[PDB]
C-alpha cells in the first residue's frame, strides 16, 4: 500500500526528512495522502523552515487529508496574493486549482480566488510582490475554470487590477506584475468574444495593452509574446477592431520598442499576421498616409530575405487585399503610384528568386558556428516553384486591377504610362521570363497567366516591351523550347496579334541571315517561330493580311 | 533630357558626346543650385557616358561622391510620408544606376576602401544595395596575401564611429563569407588581419560589452560570438594572452542581460572549452530554457559533453532529482550513451527515467527515449534486457516507425513480456513485425512461441503482416511447430484465394520451407492460383505464378490438370510476361499434358505476331536435345520460327 510505504518512509533533520520524502514520492489514494500529513508535520526562501514547507508543498502537488491540504493551499494563496511576503504559495495555489478541476468545494475555491484577485490591486498599490501578481493570474485562471457565476466578479477585479497596473528588484517585480496583468488581459479578451463587455470603457483595455507594450522591456521576450497573443485575440472582436485605429496611429511602434534580438526574431511573423488580419478588417477606414506606411513596411518585409516563405506570401496576400482599397478610391495618377510600387516590389522579389537559380540547381550560411534557429530543410526547387506559382496568381488579379484603373476614351482603352512604367514593366517581363526557367501543364498554365496579364496592357507600351525584349525571347527559346508557347498565346488573342506579328516578322527577317550555318536545334526553333507566325495570318486573316503581305 | 541621354548613348553623335564631356564640371553646377533640378537626368547622362566609353569612369571618384551626396539628400527629401506619392521612381532608378556605376568603378581598381566609404554613406538611405550586382561583386571579392591585407584593413578601420548599426551589420555580413570560404580550404587560418584584430576588437569593445543593455547592437554581439567561434575552430591561437582575452570576453557576454545573447555566450564558452571551472558552467547550462534558448543550450551541451570527461555525470543526475526541458535531458543522456559504462550507477536510473517518460515532436522524442532506454539496458551489464524488451514491446503496441520499434524490441529480447505482444491496422502490423523479428533472434523464445497467435490474428495489411510474421518465424525455427503450422495455413489460404496479403503469404511460405502449399510445385492449390493468374493475364495468383510452383508444376507429374488449365487460359487470354514465362517453363518441363504444351506453343506463336524469341530459343535447345496434333503444331511453330526476324534462331 502507498500509505504503508509513506509510513515506513516517515519512520536540522527536518530538511533531510523532507528531502527523503520527496525522493520517495518521486520513486513511487486517500490513505496515502492521509499518511503524508504527519510526515509534513514531523518535518526568506533560503530559510530551512521555508525550504521544508516548500518541499512539502511540492510533494503534495506531486501526489480527508486532501481536503485539509487544499484548504491550507487556498489560505497560502490568499496570503501570497494579498501580501508581498509569504509569496512561496504558487505551488499550493496550482495544486488547489488542479484539485478544483477534478473535492466538492470548487465554488469556495473560486470565491477565494476572486477575493485574492480583488485584493491584488491593493497589494500592487501598496508595493508601488511579483509572485503576488502571478498568484493573482493563477487565481483568475482557477476561477475561470468552473462554470460558476463568480466569473463576472473575477473579471471586474481583473479589469480593476489591469487599470491599476497601467531599483533592480523593483523593476523586476514591476515587469513580472506587468506580465501577470498581460495574462489576465489575455484571459479577459478570450472571454470578451462570448458576451458584451461589462467594462465602463471598451477601448480602455486596448489602451492598457498599448501602454503595456510601450512599458515592457525588451528583456521580457515571453511577456512580449504574450502581449502579441493578446493582440491576436483582439482581432476576434469587431467593435474593438473599429476602436483600435483611432488609438493605433503607429503600426511600427511594437517593432521599434522590440530592440532586443529576441523580439527582433519573434515579433515579425506572428505580429505581422495580427496586423494582416486587422488591416483586412479595417481597410475601409485607413488613412492614405497610413495605407502607404503599411504597404511600404510590408514591401520591405517582402524584400527582406531573412524572413520565411510564409511571411513573404502573406505580405503578398495583404498587398492584393490592399489593391481593393486602392482601386475603390478615385483613379487618380497619384493612386496608381502605390500599385506601381507594389509591382516593383514583386519584380524585386522575382529578381532575388532568379539570383539563386544556379545555386538551387548568398546561401553559404549553413556553416556558421552558432545558429539562432533550426535550419530549414525545405527543398529549394519546390519552394521556388510554389512561391513563383502563387506570386503569378497574385499578379493576375493585380494586373486586372491595374487594367480597371485607367487614367484620363482613356478609361475604356489605351491607358497612358510614363517612362518609369515602361521600365518597370520591361523589368517584370525580364525576371518573370527568367523565372519560367525553373521548369508541363502547370508551366503552360503559368504561361497562360502571363499572356493574360500582358494582353490587357496598353498596346503601345506592350509593343515597346516586345520590341525591346524579343532578343531575350529568342535567347531563351534557344535553351528550352517550352517558352515557344508565349508567342503562340500572344498571337492567339486578337488584341496583340496584329502587333506581335509585325514585331516577330521583322525580327525573324533580321535574323534570317544566319539560319543556314547554325546547328539543328537552334534552326528548328527558328523554323518553329516562322511556322507560328505563318499560322498567325491563317487564324485572323483580316488583321494579319496587311502586315504579312509586304514581307512575303 | 532623357531623349538627350539616349542621343548621347548612340555612337553617331560622337562630337556631341565630346562637347558634353567638355562641360563635365558645369553640369554639376546646376544640381548644386532636387525639385527644380532632376538628379535622375544627370545620372542617366552618367550611364550613357559610361556605356559609351569604359575609360570614362576611371577618374570620376569625386563625381561619384557628389552623386552619392545628392542621392542622399534627395532620399531624405523623398522620405516624407505625408502626401500619397511624393516618392517618384526616377530617383529610385538613379539610386540603382548609381549603384551600378559604383560596381563598375570598383571593378576598375581592386582597392576596398571605396566600398566601405559607400557603406558609411548608406546609413541613412532606406534603399539597400542592389540585390544582383552588389552581391555578385561581393562574391567576386570573396572568390592569398592580398586577401589577408584587405582583411587587415577591414578589421583595422572597422570600429569607425561614423558607421551605424545596420551598416555595421551589413559590413559583418560581408566579412563573414570570406572567412568561412577561406575556412573551407583552410588548414589553420594562420596565413595579418588577426594581428590587428588582437587589439582592435576585444579591448576596443569594452565599453560596448559593458553596456549591459539589450538593444540593436545584439547583432554586433552575435557576430562577434560567431567570428570568435570560427577563429577558435581554425585554432591558430598559439599565444595565451589572446586566449585569456577571449575567456574574459566570453564571461563578459555571459554577464549581459539579454537572454539569447547570453546562451550564445555559453555556446562560445563551450566551444572554447572544447578547443582546449567548467562544472559551474555545465550546471548553469542544465537550467530550464525556452525554444530560442533551447536550441542554443542543446547545441552547447552537444559540443560540451564529449570534452567534459577530462575536465562528472553526478551533477545532471542530481539536477534530474529535483516535458520539453525533460526532452532536452533525454537528448543529453542519449548522446552520452557511449559514456554510460563510465557512470555505471547512472545507467539504470537513466533507463528507468526514460521508460517512465516514454509512456509529431512528442512522438519522435518518445521513440528516441525508448531507443535510448533499450541501448542503456543493453550496455549496462539479464533483468535489464527483459525490462528493455517489455518497454519496447509496449511502445510497439502503442504504435516505418513501427518496424523500427519492432526491431529494437527484438534486439532487446535477444539476450518474457514479448510473448504478450506476440499474443493476439498499424498496431496489429507492428505486433506481427515484432513477433517475427523476435522469432528471428529469454523474451525472444517466448515471443517466437506466441507468434502463432499473431499469425492467426494480427490484432488486408494486417493479414499480410501476420502471414509474413508466420513465414519469418517458421524460417527461424527451421534454422516451434506452431509458427510452421500458421505459415502453412496462410499459404493454403493464399493459394485457395488465387491482394498484397496473398502475395506476402506466398513469399513468406516460400522463404519458410519449400514444402509449403504455395512453395511446393506439386501442390494443386498453387498451380490453380497460377492458372487464375494466367486467365487474367489477386496478387496471390501473381506470386504463385512467379514462384517455382508454376514453373515446376509440369515436372511434378494433381498439378498437371491445373497446369493444363493455366496453359489453356494463357492461350485464350492475351500474352503477358509472367504468364508467358510460366507457359514456357511448363512446356520445357513437359517436353523433357501434351495438349497443354501445344496450347503454350500456340500462345507463344500468337505472341510472336522478345518473349516468343526466348520460347523459340528454348525450342532450339529442345530440338538439339532431340500425338499427331502435337506434331502438326510443332510443324507450325518450327516454320513460324523460321519466318521470324531474329537471325540467330532462324540460322
> Contact B135/A260, CB-based, under 8 Å?
no
Q: Which residue has the cell 462554470?
A: A147
Cell of A451: 499572356
Residues 287-306 in B contacting A (C-alpha not used; CB under 8 Å): 290, 292, 295-296, 299
CB-nearest to A261 from B135, B233, B258 is B258
Phi first, then psi, for residue B212 (nearest 5°) are 60, 35
> Contact B183/A338, CB-based, under 8 Å?
no
A47-55 LR contacts (CB < 8 Å, sep 24+): A48/A14, A48/A15, A49/A14, A50/A88, A51/A15, A51/A18, A52/A14, A52/A15, A52/A18, A53/A88, A54/A88, A54/A91, A55/A15, A55/A18, A55/A19, A55/A21, A55/A22
Return the SS3 of B645: coil
Q: How far apart are CA A243 and CA B269, in angstroms?
A: 50
- Chain A residues touching B218 at Cβ < 8 A: 260-261, 264
* Contacts of residue B339, Cβ cutoff 8 Å, sequence gap at least 6: B305, B309, B313
Q: What angle do CA B208, B210, B214 make, to 5 degrees?
A: 75
Min CA distance, A288 vs chain B (Å)?
A: 6
Q: How far apart are CA A425 and CA A434, in angstroms?
A: 14
What does the radius of gyration of chain A's CA atoms come to, in whole angstroms? 34
**Burial grade of A454 (CB within 10 A; 0-12, 13-18, 19 or more):** buried
Structural contact between residues B539 and B497, judged by C-beta atoms closer than 8 angstroms: no
| Chain A residue nearest residue B174, CA to CA | A362
**Burial grade of A143 (CB within 10 A; 0-12, 13-18, 19 or more):** buried
Look at residues A261, A255, A266, A372 and name the one whose alpha carbon lies nearest to residue B217.
Answer: A261
Assess B40–A contact: CB distance below 8 Å, yes or no.
no
Longest dimension (CA), chain B: 117
Cell of A104: 466538492
Q: Which ranges of A128-217 would DSSP assign to H, the alpha helix?
A: 130-144, 151-165, 168-192, 204-215
DSSP per-residue codes, A451-502: HHHHHSS-HHHHHHHHHHHHHHHHHHHTT-GGGGHHHHHHHHSHHHHHHHHH
Q: How far apart are CA A47 and CA B570, in angstroms?
A: 92
DSSP per-residue codes, B256-277: -S-HHHHHHHHHHHHHHHHH--
Structural contact between residues B266 and B254, judged by C-beta atoms closer than 8 angstroms: yes
Residues of chain A with a following break (C to N over 2.5 Å): 11, 28, 43, 63, 102, 128, 166, 361, 408, 439
Other beta carbons within 10 angstroms of residue A303's beta carbon come to: 17
CA of B217: how far to CAs of B222, B316, B416, in Å?
A: 9, 34, 61
Look at residues B423, B439, B436 and name the one whose alpha carbon lies nearest to residue B464.
Answer: B436
Q: How many residues are recorded in chain A?
A: 552
CA A451 from centroid of its chain's CA atoms: 33
Return the SS3 of A12: coil
Return the SS3 of B521: coil
Other beta carbons within 10 angstroms of residue B526's beta carbon come to: 37
Q: How far apart are CA A100 and CA A139, in angstroms?
A: 11
CA B320 from centroid of its chain's CA atoms: 33
Assess B62–A contact: CB distance below 8 Å, yes or no.
no
Cell of A29: 489514494
| Chain A residue nearest residue B353, CA to CA | A27
Cell of A426: 520591361
> Contact B258/A219, CB-based, under 8 Å?
yes
> Contact A261/B214, CB-based, under 8 Å?
yes
DSSP class of residue B215? S
Q: Which residue has the cell 534530474?
A: B320
Min CA distance, B125 vs chain A (Å)?
A: 13
Return the SS3 of B90: helix
Min CA distance, B85 vs chain A (Å)?
A: 6
What does the radius of gyration of chain B's CA atoms come to, in whole angstroms? 40
Interface test with A, best of B218, B264, B298, B324 (most A CBs within 10 A): B218
- Chain B residues touching A91 at Cβ < 8 A: none
Q: What number of H helices and E strands is found in chain A? A: 27, 0
Q: How far apart are CA A5 and CA B84, in angstroms?
A: 78
Cell of A190: 478570450
Instruction: Identify the H or E element spanning A517.
Output: none
Cell of B384: 535489464
Q: How far apart are CA B493 and CA B463, in angstroms?
A: 11
**Burial grade of B642 (CB within 10 A; 0-12, 13-18, 19 or more):** exposed
Min CA distance, B215 vs chain A (Å)?
A: 5
Min CA distance, A413 vs chain B (Å)?
A: 25
CA of A8: how far to CAs of A3, A29, A58, A69, B138, in Å?
A: 9, 16, 20, 21, 74
> Contact B295/A341, CB-based, under 8 Å?
no
CA of B512: how far to CAs of A243, B313, B496, in Å?
A: 76, 48, 19
- Torsion angle of the four alpha carbons A16, A17, A21, A24, in this order, in degrees rounded to the nearest 10: 70
| Chain A residue nearest residue B290, CA to CA | A222
Assess A289–B contact: CB distance below 8 Å, yes or no.
yes
Assess B57–A contact: CB distance below 8 Å, yes or no.
no
Q: Resolution, rounded to a tenth of an Å? A: 3.4
CA of A38: how far to CAs of A2, A6, A13, A58, B124, in Å?
A: 14, 10, 15, 16, 71
CB-nearest to B84 from A334, A352, A373 is A334
Q: Which residue has the cell 537559380?
A: A357
Q: Which residue has the cell 518465424?
A: B473
Q: How far apart are CA B132 and CA A348, in angstroms?
A: 10
Q: How far apart are CA B230 and CA B249, in angstroms?
A: 15
CB-nearest to A337 from B85, B257, B260 is B85
CB-nearest to B226 from A364, A369, A419 is A369
Residues 192-221 in A contacting B (C-alpha not used; CB under 8 Å): 217-219, 221
The distance in angstroms from the start CA to the end CA of chain B is: 87
- Chain B residues touching A303 at Cβ < 8 A: 128
Q: Which residue has the cell 529442345?
A: B622
Cell of B136: 555578385
- Chain A residues touching B135 at Cβ < 8 A: 355, 362
Cell of B24: 563635365
Assess A340–B contact: CB distance below 8 Å, yes or no.
yes
Phi first, then psi, for residue B171 (nearest 5°) are -60, -45
Q: How far apart are CA B425 and CA B432, in angstroms?
A: 11
> Contact B296/A372, CB-based, under 8 Å?
yes
DSSP class of residue B128? P
Cell of A53: 514547507
- Please write down the HEC assignment for all residues of B129-188: CCHHHHHHHHHHHHCCHHHHHHHHHHHHCCCCCCCCHHHHHHHHHHHHHHHHHHHHHCCC
Look at residues A172, A199, A83, A99 and name the one whose alpha carbon lies nearest to residue A135.
Answer: A83
Q: How far apart are CA B433 and CA B425, in angstroms?
A: 12
| Chain A residue nearest residue B180, CA to CA | A367
Q: Which residue has the cell 577591414?
A: B154
B297 φψ region: left (φ > 0), alpha (ψ -120 to 50), beta (else): alpha
Q: Which residue has the cell 492458372?
A: B531
Min CA distance, B250 vs chain A (Å)?
A: 14
Q: For chain A, what percentages of helix, strand and coil (3-state, to nearest 5) are there?
A: 75, 0, 25
Interface test with A, best of B186, B233, B259, B349 (most A CBs within 10 A): B259
Q: How far apart are CA B431 and CA B399, in angstroms?
A: 9
DSSP class of residue B514? T
Structural contact between residues B537 and B572, judged by C-beta atoms closer than 8 angstroms: no
Burial A218-228 (b: 16+ CB within 10 A, else e): bbbbebbbbbb
Cell of B44: 542617366
Look at residues B585, B591, B592 and name the one whose alpha carbon lies nearest to residue B633.
Answer: B591
Q: How far apart are CA B392 and CA B499, in angstroms?
A: 31
CA of B298: how far to CAs of A349, A374, B22, B264, B412, in Å?
A: 35, 12, 67, 11, 28
Cell of A263: 523580439
Q: How far apart are CA A32 and CA A24, in angstroms?
A: 12
Q: How far apart are CA B230 and CA A49, in angstroms?
A: 50
Q: How far apart are CA B647 and CA B651, in angstroms?
A: 6
Cell of A530: 516562322
Residues 350-409 in A contacting B (C-alpha not used; CB under 8 Å): 351-352, 355, 362, 364, 367-374
CA of A41: how far to CAs of A25, A49, A68, in Å?
A: 16, 12, 13
Residues 256-285 in B contacting A (C-alpha not used; CB under 8 Å): 257-261, 264, 267-268, 271
> Contact A362/B139, CB-based, under 8 Å?
yes
Structural contact between residues B330 and B365, judged by C-beta atoms closer than 8 angstroms: yes
- Please write down the HEC assignment for all residues of B309-363: CCCCCHHHHHHHHCCHHHHHHHHHHHHHHHHCCCCCCHHHHHHHHHHHHHCCHHH
Amino acid at each position: 500500500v502507498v500509505q504503508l510505504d509513506d509510513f515506513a518512509t516517515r519512520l536540522y533533520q527536518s530538511k533531510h526528512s523532507v528531502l527523503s520524502e520527496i525522493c520517495d514520492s518521486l520513486e513511487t489514494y486517500e490513505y496515502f495522502l492521509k499518511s503524508l500529513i504527519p510526515l509534513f508535520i514531523d518535518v526568506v526562501a533560503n530559510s530551512p523552515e521555508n525550504k521544508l514547507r516548500n518541499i512539502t508543498l511540492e510533494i503534495l502537488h506531486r501526489i480527508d487529508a486532501l481536503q485539509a491540504y487544499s484548504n491550507e493551499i487556498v489560505d497560502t494563496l490568499m496570503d501570497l496574493l494579498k501580501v508581498e511576503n509569504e509569496l512561496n504559495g504558487i505551488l499550493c495555489m496550482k495544486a488547489i486549482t488542479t484539485l478544483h478541476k477534478t473535492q466538492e468545494k470548487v465554488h469556495p475555491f473560486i470565491d477565494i480566488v476572486i477575493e485574492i484577485y480583488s485584493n491584488i490591486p491593493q497589494v500592487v498599490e501598496e508595493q508601488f510582490s511579483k509572485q503576488l501578481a502571478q498568484a493573482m493570474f493563477s487565481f483568475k485562471t482557477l476561477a475561470e475554470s468552473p462554470i460558476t457565476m463568480v466569473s463576472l466578479y473575477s473579471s471586474y477585479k481583473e479589469l480593476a487590477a489591469s487599470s491599476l497596473g497601467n531599483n533592480r528588484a523593483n523593476y523586476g517585480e514591476f515587469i513580472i506584475g506587468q506580465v501577470k496583468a498581460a495574462s489576465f488581459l489575455a484571459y479577459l479578451f478570450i472571454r470578451r468574444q462570448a458576451q458584451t463587455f461589462l467594462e465602463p470603457y471598451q477601448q480602455a483595455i486596448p489602451d492598457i495593452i498599448i501602454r503595456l507594450l510601450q512599458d515592457c522591456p525588451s528583456e521580457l521576450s515571453a511577456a512580449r509574446k504574450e502581449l502579441l497573443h493578446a493582440t491576436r485575440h483582439i482581432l476576434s472582436t469587431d467593435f474593438r477592431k473599429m476602436f483600435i485605429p483611432k488609438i493605433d496611429l503607429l503600426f511600427d511602434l511594437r517593432v521599434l520598442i522590440g530592440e532586443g534580438f529576441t523580439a527582433y526574431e519573434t515579433l515579425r511573423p506572428l505580429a505581422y499576421s495580427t496586423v494582416a488580419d486587422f488591416i483586412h478588417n479595417v481597410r475601409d477606414h485607413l488613412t492614405p498616409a497610413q495605407l502607404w506606411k503599411s504597404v511600404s513596411i510590408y514591401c520591405k518585409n517582402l524584400q527582406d530575405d531573412s524572413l520565411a516563405l510564409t511571411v513573404q506570401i502573406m505580405s503578398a496576400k495583404l498587398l492584393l487585399n490592399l489593391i481593393e482599397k486602392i482601386m475603390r478610391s478615385e483613379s487618380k495618377t497619384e493612386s496608381r503610384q502605390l500599385l506601381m510600387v507594389i509591382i516593383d516590389a514583386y519584380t524585386k522579389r522575382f529578381k532575388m528568386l532568379n539570383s539563386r537559380y544556379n545555386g538551387i540547381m548568398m546561401s553559404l550560411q549553413e556553416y556558421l558556428p552558432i545558429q539562432v534557429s533550426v535550419p530549414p530543410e525545405i527543398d529549394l526547387l519546390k519552394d521556388s516553384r510554389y512561391l513563383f506559382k502563387t506570386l503569378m496568381t497574385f499578379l493576375k488579379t493585380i494586373m486586372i486591377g491595374l487594367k480597371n484603373s485607367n487614367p484620363p476614351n482613356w478609361n475604356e482603352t489605351a491607358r497612358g504610362f510614363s517612362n518609369e512604367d515602361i521600365n518597370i514593366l520591361k523589368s517584370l517581363f525580364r525576371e518573370c521570363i527568367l523565372a519560367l526557367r525553373f521548369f508541363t501543364k502547370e508551366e503552360k498554365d503559368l504561361m497562360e497567366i502571363f499572356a493574360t496579364m500582358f494582353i490587357h496592357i496598353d498596346p503601345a507600351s506592350f509593343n515597346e516591351i516586345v520590341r525591346e525584349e524579343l532578343p531575350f525571347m529568342y535567347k531563351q527559346m534557344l535553351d528550352f523550347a517550352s517558352l515557344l508557347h508565349i508567342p503562340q498565346f500572344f498571337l492567339a488573342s486578337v488584341i496583340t496579334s496584329s502587333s506581335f506579328s509585325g514585331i516577330l516578322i521583322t525580327f525573324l527577317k533580321s535574323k534570317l541571315v544566319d539560319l543556314g550555318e547554325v546547328n539543328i536545334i537552334k534552326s528548328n526553333i527558328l523554323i518553329r517561330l516562322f511556322k507560328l507566325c505563318f499560322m498567325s495570318v491563317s487564324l485572323f486573316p483580316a488583321a494579319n493580311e496587311s502586315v504579312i503581305l509586304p514581307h512575303l | 533630357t532623357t531623349r538627350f541621354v539616349y542621343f548621347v548613348g548612340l555612337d553617331s553623335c560622337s562630337s556631341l558626346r565630346a562637347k558634353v564631356l567638355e562641360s563635365l564640371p558645369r553640369v554639376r553646377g546646376l544640381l548644386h543650385q532636387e525639385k527644380c533640378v532632376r538628379f535622375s537626368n544627370l545620372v542617366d547622362l552618367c550611364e550613357s557616358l559610361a556605356a559609351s566609353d569604359k575609360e570614362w569612369i576611371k577618374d570620376k571618384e569625386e563625381l561619384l561622391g557628389e552623386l552619392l551626396d545628392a542621392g542622399s539628400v534627395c532620399l531624405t527629401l523623398k522620405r516624407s510620408s505625408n502626401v500619397v506619392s511624393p516618392l517618384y521612381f526616377q530617383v529610385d532608378q538613379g539610386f540603382e544606376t548609381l549603384q551600378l556605376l559604383y560596381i563598375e568603378y570598383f571593378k576598375s581598381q581592386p582597392l576596398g576602401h571605396e566600398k566601405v566609404f559607400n557603406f558609411i554613406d548608406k546609413i541613412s538611405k532606406e534603399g539597400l544595395p542592389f540585390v544582383l550586382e552588389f552581391d555578385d561583386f561581393i562574391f567576386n571579392e570573396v572568390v592569398i596575401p592580398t586577401v589577408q591585407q584587405t582583411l587587415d584593413t577591414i578589421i583595422r578601420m572597422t570600429p569607425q564611429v561614423s558607421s551605424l548599426d545596420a551598416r555595421v551589420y551589413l559590413y559583418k555580413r560581408i566579412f563573414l563569407p570570406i572567412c568561412i570560404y577561406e575556412s573551407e580550404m583552410h588548414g589553420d587560418l594562420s596565413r595579418a588581419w588577426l594581428k590587428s584584430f588582437d587589439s582592435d576588437v576585444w579591448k576596443a569593445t569594452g565599453p560596448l560589452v559593458d553596456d549591459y543593455t539589450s538593444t540593436l547592437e545584439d547583432r554586433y554581439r552575435l557576430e562577434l560570438m560567431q567570428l570568435t567561434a570560427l577563429l577558435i575552430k581554425g585554432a591558430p591561437t598559439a599565444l595565451t594572452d589572446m586566449r585569456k582575452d577571449i575567456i574574459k570576453f566570453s564571461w563578459n557576454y555571459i554577464k549581459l542581460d539579454d537572454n539569447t545573447s547570453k546562451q550564445a555566450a555559453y555556446v562560445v564558452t563551450a566551444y572554447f572549452i572544447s578547443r582546449f571551472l567548467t562544472t559551474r558552467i555545465f550546471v548553469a547550462l542544465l537550467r530550464c530554457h525556452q525554444i530560442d534558448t533551447r536550441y542554443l543550450v542543446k547545441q552547447a551541451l552537444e559540443l560540451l559533453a564529449p570534452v567534459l570527461s577530462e575536465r562528472w555525470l553526478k551533477w545532471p543526475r542530481r539536477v534530474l532529482s529535483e516535458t520539453q526541458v525533460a526532452n532536452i535531458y533525454q537528448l543529453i543522456v542519449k548522446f552520452p550513451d557511449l559514456f554510460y559504462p563510465a557512470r555505471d550507477h547512472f545507467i539504470p536510473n537513466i533507463i528507468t527515467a526514460m521508460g517512465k517518460l516514454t509512456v509529431l515532436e512528442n512522438q519522435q522524442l518518445a521513440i528516441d527515449l525508448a531507443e535510448l532506454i533499450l541501448k542503456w539496458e543493453t550496455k549496462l551489464p539479464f533483468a535489464q534486457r527483459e525490462a528493455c524488451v517489455t518497454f519496447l514491446i509496449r511502445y510497439i503496441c502503442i504504435s516505418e516507425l513501427g518496424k523500427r520499434a519492432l526491431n529494437i524490441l527484438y534486439e532487446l529480447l535477444g539476450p518474457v513480456k514479448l510473448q504478450f505482444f506476440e499474443r493476439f491496422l498499424l498496431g496489429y502490423c507492428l505486433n506481427a513485425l515484432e513477433v517475427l523479428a523476435v522469432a528471428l533472434k529469454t523474451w525472444i523464445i517466448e515471443n517466437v512461441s506466441y507468434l502463432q497467435k499473431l499469425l492467426e490474428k494480427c490484432l488486408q495489411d494486417i493479414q499480410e503482416i501476420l502471414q509474413k510474421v508466420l513465414g519469418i518465424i517458421l524460417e527461424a525455427i527451421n534454422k516451434e511447430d506452431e509458427p510452421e503450422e500458421v505459415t502453412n495455413f496462410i499459404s493454403l489460404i493464399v493459394n485457395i484465394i488465387g491482394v498484397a496479403a496473398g502475395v506476402s503469404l506466398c513469399w513468406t511460405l516460400s522463404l519458410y520451407r519449400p514444402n509449403a502449399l504455395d512453395s511446393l510445385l506439386p501442390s494443386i492449390m498453387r498451380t490453380f492460383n497460377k492458372l487464375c493468374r494466367d486467365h487474367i493475364a489477386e496478387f496471390e495468383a501473381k506470386v504463385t505464378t512467379n514462384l517455382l510452383e508454376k514453373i515446376l508444376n509440369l515436372c511434378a507429374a494433381d498439378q498437371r490438370r491445373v497446369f493444363l488449365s493455366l496453359l489453356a487460359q494463357l492461350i485464350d487470354r492475351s500474352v503477358d510476361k509472367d504468364m508467358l514465362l510460366k507457359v514456357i517453363n511448363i512446356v520445357t518441363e513437359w517436353i523433357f499434358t501434351t495438349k497443354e504444351k501445344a496450347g503454350i506453343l500456340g500462345k507463344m506463336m500468337i505472341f510472336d505476331l522478345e518473349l516468343s524469341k526466348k520460347f523459340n530459343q528454348v525450342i532450339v535447345d529442345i530440338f538439339e536435345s532431340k500425338h499427331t496434333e502435337l506434331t502438326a503444331r510443332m510443324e507450325t511453330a518450327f516454320l513460324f520460327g523460321t519466318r521470324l526476324s531474329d537471325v540467330s534462331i532462324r540460322k
